[PDB]
Amino acid sequence: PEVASEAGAAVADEEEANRQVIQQGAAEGLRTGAVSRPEMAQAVVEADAQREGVELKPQELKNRVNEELTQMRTMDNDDLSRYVSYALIGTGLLASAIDKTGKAGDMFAASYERQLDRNLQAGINQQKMAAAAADRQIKEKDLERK
Amino acid sequence: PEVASEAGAAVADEEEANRQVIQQGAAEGLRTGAVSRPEMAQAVVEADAQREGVELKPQELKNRVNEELTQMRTMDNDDLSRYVSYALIGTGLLASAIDKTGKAGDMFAASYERQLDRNLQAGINQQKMAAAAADRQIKEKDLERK
Amino acid sequence: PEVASEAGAAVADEEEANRQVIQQGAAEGLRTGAVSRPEMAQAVVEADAQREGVELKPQELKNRVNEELTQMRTMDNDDLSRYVSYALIGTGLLASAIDKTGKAGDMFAASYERQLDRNLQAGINQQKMAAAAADRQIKEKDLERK
Amino acid sequence: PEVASEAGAAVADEEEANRQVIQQGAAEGLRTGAVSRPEMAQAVVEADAQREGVELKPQELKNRVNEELTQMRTMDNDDLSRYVSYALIGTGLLASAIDKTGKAGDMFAASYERQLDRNLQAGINQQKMAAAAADRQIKEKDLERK
Amino acid sequence: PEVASEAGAAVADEEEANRQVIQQGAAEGLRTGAVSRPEMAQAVVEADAQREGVELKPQELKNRVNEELTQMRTMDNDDLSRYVSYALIGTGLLASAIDKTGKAGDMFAASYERQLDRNLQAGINQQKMAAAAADRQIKEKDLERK
Amino acid sequence: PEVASEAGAAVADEEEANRQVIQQGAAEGLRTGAVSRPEMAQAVVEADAQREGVELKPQELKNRVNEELTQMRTMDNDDLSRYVSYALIGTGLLASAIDKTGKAGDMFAASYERQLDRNLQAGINQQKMAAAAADRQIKEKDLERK
Amino acid sequence: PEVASEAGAAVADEEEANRQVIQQGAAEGLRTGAVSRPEMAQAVVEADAQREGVELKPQELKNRVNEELTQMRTMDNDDLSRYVSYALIGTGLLASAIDKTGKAGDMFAASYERQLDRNLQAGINQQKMAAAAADRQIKEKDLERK
Amino acid sequence: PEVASEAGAAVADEEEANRQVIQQGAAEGLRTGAVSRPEMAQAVVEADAQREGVELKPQELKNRVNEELTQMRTMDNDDLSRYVSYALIGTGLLASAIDKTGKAGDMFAASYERQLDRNLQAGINQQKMAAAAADRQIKEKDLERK
Amino acid sequence: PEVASEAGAAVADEEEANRQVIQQGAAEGLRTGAVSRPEMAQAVVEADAQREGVELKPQELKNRVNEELTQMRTMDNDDLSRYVSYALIGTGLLASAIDKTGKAGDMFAASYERQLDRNLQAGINQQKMAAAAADRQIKEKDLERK
Amino acid sequence: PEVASEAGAAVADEEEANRQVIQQGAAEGLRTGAVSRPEMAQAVVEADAQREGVELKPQELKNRVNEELTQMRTMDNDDLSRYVSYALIGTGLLASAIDKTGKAGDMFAASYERQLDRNLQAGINQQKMAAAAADRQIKEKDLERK
Amino acid sequence: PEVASEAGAAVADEEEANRQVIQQGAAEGLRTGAVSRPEMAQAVVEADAQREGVELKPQELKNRVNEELTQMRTMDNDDLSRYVSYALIGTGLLASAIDKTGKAGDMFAASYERQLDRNLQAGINQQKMAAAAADRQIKEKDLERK
Amino acid sequence: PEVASEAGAAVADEEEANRQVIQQGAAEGLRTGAVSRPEMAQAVVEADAQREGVELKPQELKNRVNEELTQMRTMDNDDLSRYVSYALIGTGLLASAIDKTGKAGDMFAASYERQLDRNLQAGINQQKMAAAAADRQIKEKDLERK
């Protein structure tokens, strides 16, 4: 019946929206320096521990914070925002013993490689050596004055 | 019975009157710089999305604003006001299962070609090289003093 | 019966008084610049539209204002006041299905003819070159001293 | 019966008395310049119109004021006072279908020719060249000292 | 019976006593200039009119005042006081249909010729050249010192 | 019976005592100049008129005052006081139809001629040339020192 | 019976004591000038008049005062005090139709002749030339020092 | 019985004690001049008069005061105090018809003789020429130092 | 029985104790001059008179005071205190017809010649010429230093 | 049954959590000098005595404090914190007569060997002489500029 | 029975203790001069008199004070304290007709003998000439430095 | 039963603890000079007297303080603290007629020779001449820099 509609309302509405809000917030926090990398490393570690439902022992908690930090050092600010959003929002698996899992999974996929395809489309980079474009602009302005 | 009167009262009265008010306001705001182009682009995108009745995902929403701005960059201020008025007021289609649709549609078309014919009649612009008119004025003034 | 008395009372008195008061007010306002020409043009256009009982759309309302301004530009202040008074007070036609229209119309024509004939009698213009009159006054004063 | 006494009390008492009070008041107003000629011209015009019981239409009301002014310009201040008093008090004609008319008429007459004969007796002016009278005064004073 | 006593009490008591009081007052007023001649002329004219019991019209009243002033211009201050006293108190004639008129008339007469012969005895004038009196006084003083 | 006692009481006691008191007061008034002669002339005239019981008319009242002043001018201050006292007090004649008039009158006489005889005895004045008295007093003083 | 005791109580005491008090008071008044001679002359005159029980008329009252003054001028201050005391206290004569008369008279006598005999005894004055007494005093002082 | 005791208590107790108190007071008053001789002369005269029970007429009261003063001028201050004390306290004679008179009289005599013989023992006078006593004192002092 | 104890408590307790206190007070008063000799002379005289129970008359009171002063002048201050104490406290004699007599008397004696014998033992005076004692003291001091 | 969950709760929850917290606190206190070594020596001695349940006498208490200080002097700060944490945390032995002892012991030993093996893995120390690393970094930056 | 305890409590408890306290107080008073010798002489005399139960007459009271003073002059301050304490506390004799006197007296004697023997043991005085002891002390210090 | 436990709780708990507290306090007081030696001597003497239950008479009390101080002069401060602690806490003997005495005695012993061998082990004294230790420290430091 309404399985697809309920799945969309419980997936598309309040899963990727908060994810993108978190992404932009983390990007701003990195940019202005208000919140530093170790804070997010610790937050990710606590989130993963809560996901596993195991109380974290303080000393190796510091150990996980450290290994997460050295893992994250090899990524830039925007990749860091992507990682943080995915980690703090990453959920799913299965609940109860009913349907609606397959539709949720397929739209998770749709959104996922939709994100990767915009990544490829935005990584095409800019062209031109930025000196011929000046010549073209000069030529158009010359046609305007003439 | 009163089908034509109802159509006129529900079309000519408060459909293009408000549209015309928004056209004037948008022209004034663009002229004085109170409201910028991106605000109008965002408003148009939100209005279109509400018309389609689909909740807008923020990121490709930014993409819609971007491509809409690229679309608008090739239009002047008055054409922009026309576009915004039409987009923010553009409605119609059919409601219920009754008459009055045909008269509404034909007077939409009438007002539309009315707007285009004023555009053509205003586009005739001005003539003369603005030096013979001075000679004409001098001649009339000479006739007056004479 | 008393139909002629009603014609005179409600058709010879209670608007030509207002007509001449409006004439005086418009003349004074134009003379002192308190009210400009576009204000009167707009008022005349609204009065005509209300007489026709049709709601007025904005840009062609401006179009009527402009063509009325072009019409007025070939008229002086006094003629403008006359025209404005006539337009603002001009009424008549027929009401109900009774008498009293014929005398109303004929005495309207009588008042109008009086207005034009007194206009001509005022426009007969002054004479004399204003140098012989000085000689006549000098001669009379000489006879007084003598 | 008492028609003559009632006639005298209704004419000789409160007809000429007010007339002469207005005469002296108008003379004083002319002399001191407190009230000007056009005010009295307009007052006379309104009084005549009220006597005729016809409402005066404003424009030709100004016309009557003008013709009254150019009629009055050929009279001096005292003649102006006479004219104004007569115009503002001029009444009479007939009332009811009874007596008292003839006595009123004859005393109106008597007062009239009384005013004219006083005017003639006052218009005899003065005589003598005003140098012989000085000689007579000198002679009398000489007889006084002697 | 008491006819003579009543006549005396109604004549000698409060008829000429008031007259003499007004004579004194008028003499003092003229002497000090507090009251001028035209005021008494107007008072005399009003008193005479009230005696005749006829309401006085304004301007002919002015000419009565005028000829009365011309009359008094031939009289000195004391004669003027006599005249004003007589005019303001002059009464008499007859009342009712009873006696006491003859006695009143005869004592009016007696007082009148009493005023006349008092006037003559005052007007007998002084004598002497005012130089022999000095010689007489010198002679008496010489007799005293001797 | 007690007729003589009553005559002595009311014809001798408060009828010369007040006379002498008035005499002394008048003499003092003349000596200090507080009250003048015309005031007593007027007072005497009013007293005489009241004695005659006749109301006094103004100018002949002044006439009696003036003739009384002329009468007084030939009298000195002391004689003036005598005359004033007599005039202000002098009474008598007869009352009722009873006795007591005779000894009252002869006692008035006695007092009168006793005033005259003391006047003559006081009018003998003084003797001596006022130089022999000095010699006599010198002789007495010389006898004293011796 | 007790007639001698009553005589002593009401006669021998109660005027001679007051007489002597009056004497000393009059002497002091003369000495200090507080009260003058004419005051006592007038007081004596009034006392004598009251003794005679006759009211005094003011003028001859002044006459008695004057004759008393010229009578008193020939007496010194102490004789004046004696005379004044006797005059203001002098009483006696007879009362009722009983005793108390004769012994009153004889003790008045005794007091009187006692006053005269002390006057004679005090009139012996002083003796000696007031130079031999100095010699006697010198001699006694010489016997004292010796 | 107690006749002698009563006499002593009524004589020796409050007769001489007060007498000697007045003696001391009079001596002190004369010594300091607080009270003069004439005051005590007057007091003595008044006391004697009261003892005789006769009212004193003022003038011969002064006479007795003067003669008493002449009597006292021949006595010194202490004799004067004796005299005044005796005079102001001098009493005695007889009262009632009982005994106690003889004892009082004999003790009066005893006290009197005591006063005289004390006076003599005080008046035995001092001896020596007041130069041998100096030699005696010098001699005693000589044996004192030796 | 207790008669000897009663005598001791009535004599030795409050007779010589107050006597010695009085002696000390008198000695101190004489030493400091607070109380002079005549005061105690008068006090002793009054005490003796009160003991004799006879009222004291002023003069011979002064005589006893003077003779007591003469008696005291031959006594020194200490002996004066002894005498004053003895006189002021000296009492005794006999009362009623019972015991308290012999023991009181002979203990009075015991105290009396006890006072005399201590007087003699104190009057043995001091010995030595006050120069050998200095030599003895010098010798003892020399023995101390040695 | 649930002996394993109770084992984890009673071994890993609040047993080495407080141990590691105490480790951190002791390390910080030693680093900042807030708490000195003798304080922890005394605390350790008191904890051991309380574990043995024997009251400590003063001097040998000082003796244990001193020997514990000697024991600590051969240790650095970090291992001192380790020892202190073990001292006031180390507990165990057996309670009641039930299970849960074996799991407690074995996973106590598990955490223990974990602590030593991580100690050895952290004690592997750093390598390189710190001059070749600079060369490598220089080469990498050269490749970046190139 | 408890006779020994009663004797000890009422003989040795509050009898020598207050005696020694009195000794200390007297010694301090002598040392600081707060209380002088004559005060204690008088106190001792009064205490002895009260012991004999006889009232002391003031003069020979001074005599006993003097003889006590000359007795005490032959003793030093500490012996004076001994004597004063013994005199002020010295009691004993016998009371009632019961036992407890004998051992009271013999241990009185024991305490007295203790006092005298400790005085002898304290009077053994110090030895050495106070120069050899300096040599011994120097030798000991020399042994110390060496 | 609990005899040993009762003995230990009544001896080891509150006998040596208080004793050693007083030892520490006395050592501190002697070190800082707050409490002097005579105060401790007096306290010890009073405690001993109270233990003997005999009231100490003041003078021989001073004797005990004196020779007690002479005994104390041959001991140092720490030996003095030992002595005062033992004297002020020294108790024991036997109470009631029950057990627990032997165990108390043997633990008194145990504590006693525990104090003795602690004293010996503290008095084993230090070794070395304090110049070879400097060489040893220099050698170790040289090995460290090497």
PDB file of N, CA, C and O in Angstrom, chain D residues 12 16-17 20 114 118, chain E residues 55 57-60 63:
ATOM      1  N   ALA D  12     -43.034 106.583  10.667  1.00  0.00           N
ATOM      2  CA  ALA D  12     -42.172 107.653  11.151  1.00  0.00           C
ATOM      3  C   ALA D  12     -41.221 107.187  12.243  1.00  0.00           C
ATOM      4  O   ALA D  12     -40.181 107.820  12.453  1.00  0.00           O
ATOM      5  N   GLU D  16     -37.521 105.769   8.848  1.00  0.00           N
ATOM      6  CA  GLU D  16     -36.483 106.748   8.565  1.00  0.00           C
ATOM      7  C   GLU D  16     -35.378 106.726   9.610  1.00  0.00           C
ATOM      8  O   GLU D  16     -34.234 107.051   9.288  1.00  0.00           O
ATOM      9  N   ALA D  17     -35.684 106.344  10.851  1.00  0.00           N
ATOM     10  CA  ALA D  17     -34.666 106.380  11.897  1.00  0.00           C
ATOM     11  C   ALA D  17     -33.516 105.441  11.570  1.00  0.00           C
ATOM     12  O   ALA D  17     -32.345 105.845  11.573  1.00  0.00           O
ATOM     13  N   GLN D  20     -31.490 106.720   8.531  1.00  0.00           N
ATOM     14  CA  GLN D  20     -30.536 107.783   8.809  1.00  0.00           C
ATOM     15  C   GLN D  20     -29.375 107.292   9.658  1.00  0.00           C
ATOM     16  O   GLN D  20     -28.247 107.779   9.505  1.00  0.00           O
ATOM     17  N   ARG D 114     -39.174 116.621   1.783  1.00  0.00           N
ATOM     18  CA  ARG D 114     -38.481 117.259   2.896  1.00  0.00           C
ATOM     19  C   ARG D 114     -36.972 117.093   2.740  1.00  0.00           C
ATOM     20  O   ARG D 114     -36.206 118.055   2.892  1.00  0.00           O
ATOM     21  N   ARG D 118     -34.357 120.171   1.961  1.00  0.00           N
ATOM     22  CA  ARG D 118     -33.173 120.361   2.793  1.00  0.00           C
ATOM     23  C   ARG D 118     -31.907 120.354   1.948  1.00  0.00           C
ATOM     24  O   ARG D 118     -30.986 121.143   2.188  1.00  0.00           O
TER      25      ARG D 118
ATOM     26  N   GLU E  55     -41.609 112.503  19.493  1.00  0.00           N
ATOM     27  CA  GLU E  55     -40.298 111.912  19.273  1.00  0.00           C
ATOM     28  C   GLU E  55     -39.560 112.704  18.201  1.00  0.00           C
ATOM     29  O   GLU E  55     -40.148 113.120  17.200  1.00  0.00           O
ATOM     30  N   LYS E  57     -36.752 113.406  15.316  1.00  0.00           N
ATOM     31  CA  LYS E  57     -36.019 112.777  14.236  1.00  0.00           C
ATOM     32  C   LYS E  57     -34.564 113.242  14.381  1.00  0.00           C
ATOM     33  O   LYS E  57     -34.311 114.286  14.983  1.00  0.00           O
ATOM     34  N   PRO E  58     -33.575 112.476  13.903  1.00  0.00           N
ATOM     35  CA  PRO E  58     -32.177 112.917  14.077  1.00  0.00           C
ATOM     36  C   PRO E  58     -31.747 114.249  13.459  1.00  0.00           C
ATOM     37  O   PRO E  58     -31.329 115.146  14.203  1.00  0.00           O
ATOM     38  N   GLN E  59     -31.813 114.425  12.134  1.00  0.00           N
ATOM     39  CA  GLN E  59     -31.082 115.565  11.580  1.00  0.00           C
ATOM     40  C   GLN E  59     -31.794 116.883  11.844  1.00  0.00           C
ATOM     41  O   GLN E  59     -31.132 117.901  12.084  1.00  0.00           O
ATOM     42  N   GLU E  60     -33.127 116.905  11.782  1.00  0.00           N
ATOM     43  CA  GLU E  60     -33.804 118.139  12.151  1.00  0.00           C
ATOM     44  C   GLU E  60     -33.547 118.466  13.611  1.00  0.00           C
ATOM     45  O   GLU E  60     -33.482 119.641  13.965  1.00  0.00           O
ATOM     46  N   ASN E  63     -30.482 120.405  13.510  1.00  0.00           N
ATOM     47  CA  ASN E  63     -30.682 121.815  13.166  1.00  0.00           C
ATOM     48  C   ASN E  63     -31.376 122.594  14.284  1.00  0.00           C
ATOM     49  O   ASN E  63     -31.148 123.801  14.426  1.00  0.00           O
TER      50      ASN E  63
END
